[PDB]
Amino acid sequence: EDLPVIPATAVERVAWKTLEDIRKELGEQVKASEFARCLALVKRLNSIHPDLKPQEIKDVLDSFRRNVQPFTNVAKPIPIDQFGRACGVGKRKASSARAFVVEGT
Amino acid sequence: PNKPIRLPPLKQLRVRQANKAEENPCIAVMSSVLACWASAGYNSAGCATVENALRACMDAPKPAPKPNNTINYHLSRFQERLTQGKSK
Amino acid sequence: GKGRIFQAAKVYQRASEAAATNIVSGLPPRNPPLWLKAIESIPPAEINTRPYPIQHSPPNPRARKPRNLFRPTKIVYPEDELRRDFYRDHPWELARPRMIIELDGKDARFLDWSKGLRQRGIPLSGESVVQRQLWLMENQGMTKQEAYDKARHEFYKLRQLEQMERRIAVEEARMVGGYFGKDLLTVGMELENKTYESWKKWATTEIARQESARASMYTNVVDN
Amino acid sequence: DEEALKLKQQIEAIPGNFKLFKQTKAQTQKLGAGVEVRYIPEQYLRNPPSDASLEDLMAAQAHMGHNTSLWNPANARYIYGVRQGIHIISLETTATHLRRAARVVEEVAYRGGLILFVGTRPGQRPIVVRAAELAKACHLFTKWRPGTITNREQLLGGVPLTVVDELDRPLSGFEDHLHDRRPLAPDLVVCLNPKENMTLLYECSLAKIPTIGIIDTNTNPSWVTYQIPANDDSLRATALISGVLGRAGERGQKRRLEAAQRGVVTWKTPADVQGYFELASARAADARRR
Amino acid sequence: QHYLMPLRDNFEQEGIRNFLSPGSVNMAYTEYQTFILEKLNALVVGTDFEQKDTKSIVLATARDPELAHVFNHASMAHNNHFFFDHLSPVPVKMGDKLFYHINENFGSVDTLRDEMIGTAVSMFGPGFVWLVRTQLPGQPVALRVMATYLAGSPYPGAHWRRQEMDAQTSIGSSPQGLSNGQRFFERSAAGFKGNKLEPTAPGGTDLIPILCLNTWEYAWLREYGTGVGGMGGKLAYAQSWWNMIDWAKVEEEARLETRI
Amino acid sequence: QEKASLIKSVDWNLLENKFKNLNLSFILNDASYAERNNLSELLNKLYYNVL
RNA sequence: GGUUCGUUCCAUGGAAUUAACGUAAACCCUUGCUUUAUUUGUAAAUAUUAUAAAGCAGUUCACCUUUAUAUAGGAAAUGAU
Ligand SMILES: [Mg+2]
Ligand SMILES: [Mg+2]
Ligand SMILES: [Mg+2]
Ligand SMILES: [Mg+2]
């Protein structure tokens, strides 16, 4: 506790584990309130200066990191034909339209 | 003048309605409109200013509900300490 | 009779009897709990037995059938009378913050009230005047009023020097280039400003409500 | 943009400033005069006292009873008087009942017993955990789950156990026994707030387990086996009482281990484990036969 | 309570050979420090400072004007002991590293001597002459001389009571007077409003007092007398003091950055 | 643990996420490692081989 | 005692700890996107309707507000989508 601390705005963000993740790995029905006070410690011990931070605190702090990656689903951009006609698609309740838009009058 | 009594043992110390009920402010504006009509006439000019106020009400959006009051939780804590105790 | 029956004061007796013989007759009893031999020679103490409590003041010798015989009595000392007399003549002596938390409880080992008011460990308080007063009133055979004056006057001369140091210390420091922070007087006024402003807002808001109520109270339903 | 980068080289200085600041704190500090520090808030944990004197008990507010009205008349044998509208517990009655309890904690720990320090209050977690470490016992700083003693089969079903020996080291060969064996129960429960958790104490009475509790002026003394009349609402008195009891267990565990290195076991095998012995040879008897 | 601690090398019993008599040090430290501590105890007998060390009291009661009288006894006890904790029975040979740093900041070893001694006499008042080690964020370790009045403190945390120069003989209408006067009001105005004129590094690591010289009259007016005719007095006291400076300790506490 | 849910996270060990471009031409073309163009070598690094 | 579409979740009780069914989840159709396939479907085509296998996606993010600080909620054509 005597080691210095870093301001809350300078500590890089970290995605800590949630109450559900801890309940599963430990196999215990951890209480939400008792876990909230335990997470504050992790946030407190995380603000210690990295260089001055000991090795033990580093490892024990790595077991609380949430290494989850959400699925990426990016839509494909609508290209433009060589002649300049872009094809859009729309549907309404039975239909399927295909509009070819070009610079015109 | 005697002082307040020490409540007997109750099944639960709580207020029936924690949050004050706020009278619809526009039932009061309607009462005024109903007053102009009786004194003067149903179809007159002196009622224009008051009728508009009633129209301004129902066009305005309803305010948001106030946060719930936590009085009943604190009363349950100090029940046995304040009253003679708990029953049942 | 709602409460349950606690037999905690007989765990050794009950547990020892259950280990004397085995359920399966003809066999030797199994080893008893590991605590049976630990409290073998440490029986509980007698509880739930109302004794005659210590009498801190002579009981009424006139009562023919007194009650509350098994009721603890109030602790009263001769100083209680003096404390009340002093702190009433000096009410603002209570505003002086005094610490009652004890460090080790040995503060009474170095209190020799024959020397004077200033002692070791304890601050100069109204208590030092009472103890010094009590000592003179007992050893030197002084009256309650005489000893009160003596110990009381020594208290003033010590309090005066403490108030004179603050003024002379600050003034002396500034003569050599010593600057200080905000004094309690200025800090107190700034807080009153922040609170007064909040009252101005409330009064302004409430004043508006009252005047608005008057407009609605008066009947302007028909404009002619 | 330097205004946003000027916080970095400040962060690069924290290691240097801290190192230089700590060094400076060693030379100049303590130069003026020597202070007679005779009380530190966290002194009952760093180095709790072996025994408690009348001054330690009084300094820790161990004599402050509850209001005169909120009192159990049965426990009036320990009250010294009345002052400030409260009941004053006799300091001499607390010291005597405390030393007697410290003797029970030592003997139970000296005979290989399982102790359980129980303090369930907002700030009683560091106190109970510290005392359990000294005595090599179990701690409990949360609400006691009703049925952990009388219904241990279900509650403490999956919690693992181990088999140790004279010198408290594991013994390989009891794997099959650690699956049919039923859970354990404490041989001595040291409660620091018997008024709050009466479900735990009643189970101990039902289960024939000795108990030690801090009986306040409003607590029923018939709930524990060995009472310690004192103030349980003071977090400073609880640390002293538990500290003394923690040292007792530590002193008891030492004698037990010192007596084991000489081949003198201060306890015989428990009944449950003892039964699994004769059955073990019974299974081996078939090997010799067949 | 605060109790008197023994001195460094048995001075209370024998005193330094060629600097202070055994009876002078007795009246300078044993009889005086005990007197200050006796007064100090009575002031913090029932406060939070009852178990705090002197330095902690020197920094805590620096700006508060109602506790100014407490700062004096605290800083006086610290500055006094700080002066005796740097002497030695026999003169010590200055270190090579320290000897080279002094020349880079003062030109020569004796150039600093005549500066400290000169500042003591020029001050003409009870105070302490400090040899501080100032290091700014990007500046190298540089030394300088600082003089403090009756109970001034060299640490930056107690800048409210540094007491570097007098106001009676340094604030007038002359060009230097107006300048000095402006600084006096600027400090009081900034200190009151809470604004800081000179940024300070966290932990008060800017200034580190290495050496001190107690110019208080109660320490030398007995051994060296008043100094009529220039023989003895305050001047000779400062000169003789230079021979007993524990330059070895002055180098250790300096903590000069390795540069050679 | 039996009744505990399962968080949805991308499993980068799946053969569908490992090689987003499934064509052998892109893969075996010295993408990351050197001189592993042999198709058999690539398969051995993905499946358990008995031979 | 609060909260939630919900015995949902949190806190708490001088008695609780758990199991099964229903609930919930998941499943089928539908909506957006990605990949695969191009005949008997599609004007052309560098591939965009349709057809149908698998996979992803929500109250997620942002904003506002928030009890006992434990659980969260609101806003609904002019934040993203
Ligand atoms: Mg109590
Ligand atoms: Mg329940
Ligand atoms: Mg075809
Ligand atoms: Mg399609």
From Swiss-Prot, chain C:
One GO CC annotation: mitochondrial small ribosomal subunit
Main localization (coarse): mitochondrion
Stored InterPro entries: Ribosomal_mS23_fun
Keywords noted in UniProt: Mitochondrion, Ribonucleoprotein, Ribosomal protein
GO MF annotations in UniProt: structural constituent of ribosome
Compartment annotation: Mitochondrion
Domain of life per record: Eukaryota
PANTHER family in alphabetical order: 37S RIBOSOMAL PROTEIN S25, MITOCHONDRIAL, SMALL RIBOSOMAL SUBUNIT PROTEIN MS23
Record function comment: Component of the mitochondrial ribosome (mitoribosome), a dedicated translation machinery responsible for the synthesis of mitochondrial genome-encoded proteins, including at least some of the essential transmembrane subunits of the mitochondrial respiratory chain. The mitoribosomes are attached to the mitochondrial inner membrane and translation products are cotranslationally integrated into the membrane.
Protein family (similarity comment): Belongs to the mitochondrion-specific ribosomal protein mS23 family.
Subunit: Component of the mitochondrial small ribosomal subunit (mt-SSU). Mature N.crassa 74S mitochondrial ribosomes consist of a small (37S) and a large (54S) subunit. The 37S small subunit contains a 16S ribosomal RNA (16S mt-rRNA) and 32 different proteins. The 54S large subunit contains a 23S rRNA (23S mt-rRNA) and 42 different proteins.
Protein name: Small ribosomal subunit protein mS23
Species assigned in the record: Neurospora crassa (strain ATCC 24698 / 74-OR23-1A / CBS 708.71 / DSM 1257 / FGSC 987)
Species lineage: Eukaryota, Fungi, Dikarya, Ascomycota, Pezizomycotina
UniProtKB/Swiss-Prot annotation, chain D:
Protein name: Small ribosomal subunit protein uS2m
UniProt-annotated location(s): Mitochondrion
Family: Belongs to the universal ribosomal protein uS2 family.
Lineage, opening ranks: Eukaryota, Fungi, Dikarya, Ascomycota, Pezizomycotina
Annotated disulfide bonds: none
Full-protein interval shown: 107 to 396 of 428
GO MF annotations, alphabetized: structural constituent of ribosome
Subunit structure: Component of the mitochondrial small ribosomal subunit (mt-SSU). Mature N.crassa 74S mitochondrial ribosomes consist of a small (37S) and a large (54S) subunit. The 37S small subunit contains a 16S ribosomal RNA (16S mt-rRNA) and 32 different proteins. The 54S large subunit contains a 23S rRNA (23S mt-rRNA) and 42 different proteins.
GO biological process: translation
Organism encoding this protein: Neurospora crassa (strain ATCC 24698 / 74-OR23-1A / CBS 708.71 / DSM 1257 / FGSC 987)
Domain of life: Eukaryota
Main localization, broad class: mitochondrion
Keywords: Mitochondrion, Ribonucleoprotein, Ribosomal protein
GO cellular component: mitochondrial small ribosomal subunit
Cited function: Component of the mitochondrial ribosome (mitoribosome), a dedicated translation machinery responsible for the synthesis of mitochondrial genome-encoded proteins, including at least some of the essential transmembrane subunits of the mitochondrial respiratory chain. The mitoribosomes are attached to the mitochondrial inner membrane and translation products are cotranslationally integrated into the membrane.
Coiled coil ranges: none
